[PDB]
CSV table of C-alpha atoms in Angstrom, one decimal:
chain,number,residue,atom,x,y,z
A,1,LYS,CA,-22.9,-38.3,37.0
A,2,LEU,CA,-23.4,-37.5,33.3
A,3,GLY,CA,-26.2,-35.3,34.4
A,4,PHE,CA,-23.6,-32.7,35.3
A,5,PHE,CA,-22.2,-32.4,31.8
A,6,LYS,CA,-25.5,-31.8,30.1
A,7,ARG,CA,-25.8,-29.0,32.6
A,8,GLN,CA,-22.8,-27.0,31.6
A,9,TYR,CA,-22.7,-28.5,28.1
A,10,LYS,CA,-26.3,-27.9,27.1
A,11,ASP,CA,-25.9,-24.2,28.2
A,12,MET,CA,-22.7,-23.7,26.1
A,13,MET,CA,-24.2,-25.6,23.1
A,14,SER,CA,-27.2,-23.1,23.2
A,15,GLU,CA,-24.9,-20.2,24.0
A,16,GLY,CA,-24.7,-19.6,20.3
A,17,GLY,CA,-21.0,-20.0,19.9
A,18,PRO,CA,-19.1,-20.1,23.2
A,19,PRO,CA,-15.4,-19.2,23.3
A,20,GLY,CA,-12.7,-21.8,23.9
A,21,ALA,CA,-13.2,-23.8,20.7
A,22,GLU,CA,-15.5,-26.2,22.6
A,23,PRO,CA,-18.7,-26.4,20.6
A,24,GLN,CA,-20.8,-28.3,23.1
């Protein structure tokens, strides 16, 4: 099910500095 993380994680990591202090 890890395929779900890389889905929302990869998007945030590329976001360019997503809020929440969670640097994907």
